[PDB]
Amino acid sequence: LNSCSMPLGMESKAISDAQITASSYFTNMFATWSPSKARLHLQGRSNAWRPQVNNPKEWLQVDFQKTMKVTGVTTQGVKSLLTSMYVKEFLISSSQDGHQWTLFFQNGKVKVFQGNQDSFTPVVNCLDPPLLTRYLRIHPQSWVHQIALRMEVLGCEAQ
């Protein structure tokens, strides 16, 4: 049990909207599931990030504005009407400049994190080893009904 595992700012909004971006997002005159909606326990009609299309090539990115020691992530889905929407598996990549990205590996291969199994229960996935990075990306790989994501990043200061 280490101290380097505190919520960095997705739920609290310590991490501003501008720091959260994505490959794309689902929006129309009825709803806007923008990147900055990807916050753990956020309430609302379109309270989650949803890519414009459900494909494994989409991603959600967080910029801490400085190097942080990331020790884990927490993911959650959402439910709209009678439809549960959540990511079951995902990958993680990181970068220092925001151009060169590297996937997180575990036991000789790309780590496919086991995510959520329902609409509202958060699932914590620890990173062993931790990552020292300024930029972090989540890559949905499998999902139930639709790719929808609310999250949090766990860690502490680096440098």
Domains in the chain, please, with CATH? 1-159 (2.60.120.260)
Of 67, 48, 65, 32, nearest to 138 by C-alpha is: 48
How many angstroms separate the CA atoms of 87 and 149, rounded?
Answer: 7
Give, in degrees to the nearest 5, the angle at Cα 60 between 136 and 36. 105
Exposed e or buried b per residue across 25-63, where buried means at least 16 C-beta atoms within 10 angstroms of its C-beta: bbeeeeeebbbbbbbbebeeebbbbbbeeeeeebbbbbb
Give 54-117 as a DSSP string: --TT--EEEEEEEEEEEEEEEEE-EEETTEEEEEEEEEEEEESSSSS-EE-EETTEE--EE--S
What is the structure's resolution, reported in angstroms to one decimal?
A: 1.5
DSSP 3-state of 9: coil
What kind of experiment solved this structure? X-ray
